[PDB]
Design a protein around this ligand. Sequence first.
Ligand SMILES: *CC(=O)Cn1nnc(-c2ccccc2)c1COC(=O)NCc1ccccc1
Ligand SMILES: *CC(=O)Cn1nnc(-c2ccccc2)c1COC(=O)NCc1ccccc1
Lengths: 213, 213
Amino acid sequence: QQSQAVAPVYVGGFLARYDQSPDEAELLLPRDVVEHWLHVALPLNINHDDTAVVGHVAAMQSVRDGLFALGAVTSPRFLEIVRRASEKSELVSRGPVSPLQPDKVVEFLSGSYAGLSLSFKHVALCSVGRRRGTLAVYGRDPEWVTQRFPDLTAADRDGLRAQWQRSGDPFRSDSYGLLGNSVDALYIRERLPKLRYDKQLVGVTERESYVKA
Amino acid sequence: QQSQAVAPVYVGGFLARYDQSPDEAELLLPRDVVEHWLHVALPLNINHDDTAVVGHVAAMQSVRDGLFALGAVTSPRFLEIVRRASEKSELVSRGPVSPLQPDKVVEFLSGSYAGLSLSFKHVALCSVGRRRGTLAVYGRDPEWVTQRFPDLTAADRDGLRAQWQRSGDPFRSDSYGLLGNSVDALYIRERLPKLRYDKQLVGVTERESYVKA
Ligand SMILES: *CC(=O)Cn1nnc(-c2ccccc2)c1COC(=O)NCc1ccccc1
Ligand SMILES: *CC(=O)Cn1nnc(-c2ccccc2)c1COC(=O)NCc1ccccc1
């Protein structure tokens, strides 16, 4: 009964795509805007709840199509909550596409928090992203996540790899609070279609990913 | 700090509509089929988990448009889980339509478990119903639920009122398991449209209900 499930999980995805006009004008975030900002690491939480910090952003890099980010989900307290819920979900028990090994925790995160949202203050794991192309790809190896993204070049991958190889438990929230933001996710209009769309956009598929959408 | 929130909640809705052909042929359940069955009360649980019994069905009655049911959510352990999660959800904090008093718990249940599903073995509270018209209406008074359903007649309401006026905590599941079936609900195709549809069908609206869809 070795628990090699509550070990770190990495997540990567585009925080913003330079080929996609927002739905609202307020989401517009251009290349020049973003690169000025790339100039003390910044945290990773759930649905913008500062009480629900689960890890940190390990590397961001602006590339041709947008702003890529790759975080680490390190919080023991959070990963353990995730582990207990995934034992209880039918979507997880159906497992990934045959070739991929079953990873109950990586799948659960893949299902629940399928999007990325940049507010830099911090990065959040949403149910979906508000901005298109914000697909969140979870995995046990930092190099595994990055390689799902075709638009990323070898040289791109090397800029990231330099960063992710460059104080207690930061998760003060709990099962009841994640339960709380789960029903909120149910009422996001066209959640799946939006997600199926980001999948086609950044080039990821489920026969190469734990993406559940 | 009086907790008049973890008190009983009632839920009513059509288990099956006699004017709606199923999507699959296997859901067909006709009037004659149902009335033979009306001939020891039957339990009410969450997503067909027998470990997650939250109460019981207090009255069923076949009427012109279908099979109406009205249950009671009595489980202290479950209602308390629901109370803690609703404090943590943005949809609940936005409250019902102005006239309706805020009821964090009744709203949370309204959002999470918006559908009814009959498997009689037992009735389940789903995210959505598989059968159309299975809209689950939650409320603090048994008579309040019934009166949201226009198709129900006075005489219909009197048949029910006779039944709902006619052993420990039955919830052995917990926060982690409801968390588990929450992400499963996210991947039900056209969840909202299906729900907005049942709303129009059985005649309920949100300006008269805690329905969040
Ligand atoms: C990642 C975020 O910034 C949070 N978020 N993700 N998707 C949405 C959203 C909500 C409505 C319509 C489209 C997208 C959000 C917004 O979060 C909020 O501040 N509002 C809370 C809320 C969310 C869903 C339903 C009702 C209220
Ligand atoms: C009330 C129920 O009987 C459970 N339920 N509610 N909606 C669905 C459903 C699932 C897929 C497509 C349409 C409707 C279900 C079915 O529950 C299951 O047995 N399958 C588990 C599951 C649910 C959602 C997504 C993936 C797997």
